[PDB]
Symmetry: D2
Subunit: 115 residues, 4 copies
């Protein structure tokens, strides 16, 4: 799979488990088209979102439903969600990992692109 | 000044200067309506986006145009921009600072919320 | 004020107030010599640690006592403290802001370095 | 292994490869005793540092030689190294992952403690 998402919890020092993730692809009319989605596993990871065939070049948005995650833990959060927007490029290494570290009023995201 | 944006550059250890910022507010029809925009100063700070009267309850999106920043410095970054989406003022007026720390393949964002 | 420390709380979305900070400087015998200390104010900022005359070339360690901060708030955190170690002023005097963003099991730190 | 270290590079969007990592344990006389060390793999990870038998409760310091990493890439860095100092506690989950995300003038570190 060319696209993986990993989510960590900075308050509990744990993977962020059962977090909803939605992936969108920018369509020609400039709107966001549903592309793939799922929920992070017990390791905070979401595998199997797409295939090499389907993951063509383009602009993609990964939406991490952080607000629901914190609410389920009884913790009051700031953001509605975390959004990661990037261009997939065939020249570059082949595999994309979108990692996010979550706190109630902050998040960090990085991209690990490898061959 | 109930909304301020601050942007730092993690590669240079400096304020991120001349970063374009667009603010949107979700409308009744659930689309993103333009609300305010500006560019960060020499200190990396963007003041004067809105007023207490204008900055009503709602869901706001702060778009930080990180790609245009890195590309103006001769660098090809990963993200198109950084998007910070939050409900504001739903327990009354607050002051929000949206801070962001930028690297070519990563960014952090945090919010400081104070009661005037 | 060539050295300033700023600390934010990522759980509350607020400045991290009353955070103890200890600064050390590596001595000729390669031990850490106490250099300055203080506590962050209501803004999360610690000013007045040192002077331009006193803040000479060297390797400095800024210890931020994150554990005592979280424990004073009734929380059991992971780290003992956050340590920021850097060479300073080796191309002449600079102004350093050491910023840190704190969560119970995580912290970020960045440096803003400017030329007076 | 109860202790793993992972290092990522925020400038290149890649694992931080061949980074030296030194682990120390605080001794009774308040000095730092060498405990384990190694270099991150091609995945940015350092496995096999210690064993359950040796990793007793105590205060540990993980030192990541970030300055040498950046110099080898021709990039001018700020920090001498990144230090992560924490108490190992037997009540807690058993496995500790110390993760660090590196930029030239900034770094983030988080702890993932799982069972
Ligand atoms: O630095 C500021 O004044 C506010 O923004 C920030 N604050 C901290 Cl503590 C970090 Cl690590 C990064 C940023 Cl961008
Ligand atoms: O830890 C991973 O496996 C990848 O994701 C991450 N990696 C690092 Cl280094 C930090 Cl500090 C945070 C995250 Cl979310
Ligand atoms: Na309300
Ligand atoms: Na010199």
């Amino acid at each position: 799979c060319p696209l993986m998402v990993k989510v960590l919890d900075a308050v509990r020092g744990s993977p962020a488990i059962n977090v909803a993730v939605h992936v969108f692809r920018k369509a020609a009319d400039d709107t966001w088209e549903p592309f793939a989605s799922g929920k992070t596993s017990e390791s905070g990871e979401l595998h199997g979102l797409t295939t090499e065939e389907e993951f063509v070049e383009g602009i993609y948005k990964v939406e991490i439903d952080t607000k629901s995650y914190w609410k389920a833990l009884g913790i009051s959060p700031f953001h509605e969600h975390a959004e990661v927007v990037f261009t997939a490029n065939d020249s570059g290494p082949r595999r994309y990992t979108i990692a996010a570290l979550l706190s109630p009023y902050s998040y960090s995201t990085t991209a690990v692109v490898t061959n």
